[PDB]
Amino acid sequence: SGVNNTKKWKMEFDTRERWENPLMGWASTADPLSNLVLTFSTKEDAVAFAEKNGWSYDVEERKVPKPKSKSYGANFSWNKRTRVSTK
């Protein structure tokens, strides 16, 4: 339920091939950017950084949980379906 990891903007790169090392079966890679993750305060900071570095980029809008309407009293409604059958 914690939301502290949904505060900052991130920049990752496209995932590339990983294969099994013949000797050990370890996951091998040839992609030098496979672990590169950058953090940004705003979307504009991230987009500006990508642009000057020449990287083609995709931006996805921040998803904010919609504000909800909560009422403990609704659990015991006289005539509505919100009445709970158990506690």
Partner 1 sequence: KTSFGSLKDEDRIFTNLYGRHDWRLKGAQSRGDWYKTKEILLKGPDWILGEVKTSGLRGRGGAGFPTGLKWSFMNKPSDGRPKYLVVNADEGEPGTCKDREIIRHDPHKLVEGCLVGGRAMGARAAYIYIRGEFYNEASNLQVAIREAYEAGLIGKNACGSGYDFDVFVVRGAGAYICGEETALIESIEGKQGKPRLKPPFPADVGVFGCPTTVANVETVAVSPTICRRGGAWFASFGRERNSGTKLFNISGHVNNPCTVEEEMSVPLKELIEKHAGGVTGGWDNLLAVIPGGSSTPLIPKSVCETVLMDFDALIQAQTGLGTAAVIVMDRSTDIVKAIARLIEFYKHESCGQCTPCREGVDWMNKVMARFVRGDARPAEIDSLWEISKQIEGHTICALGDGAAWPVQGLIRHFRPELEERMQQFAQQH
Partner 2 sequence: ALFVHRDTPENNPETPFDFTPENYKRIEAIVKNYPEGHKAAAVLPVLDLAQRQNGWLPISAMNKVAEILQVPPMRVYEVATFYTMYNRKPVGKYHIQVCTTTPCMLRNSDSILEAIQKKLGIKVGETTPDKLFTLIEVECLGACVNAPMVQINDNYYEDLTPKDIEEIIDELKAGKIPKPGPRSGRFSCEPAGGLTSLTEPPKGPGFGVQAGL
Which residues of the chain form contacts with partner 2 (CB under 8 A)? 79, 85-86
Answer yes or no whether residue 5 interacts with partner 1 by CB under 8 A.
no
35 binds, among partner 2, partner 1, none (CB under 5 to 8 A by kind): none
Torsion of CA 27, 28, 32, 33, to 10 degrees: -30
Write down the least CB distance from residue 4 to partner 1, Å: 24
d(CA 55, CA 57): 6
Helix (H), strand (E) at residue 39: strand 38-40
Answer yes or no whether residue 1 interacts with partner 1 by CB under 8 A.
no
Toward partner 1, which CB reaches closer, 6 or 75? 75
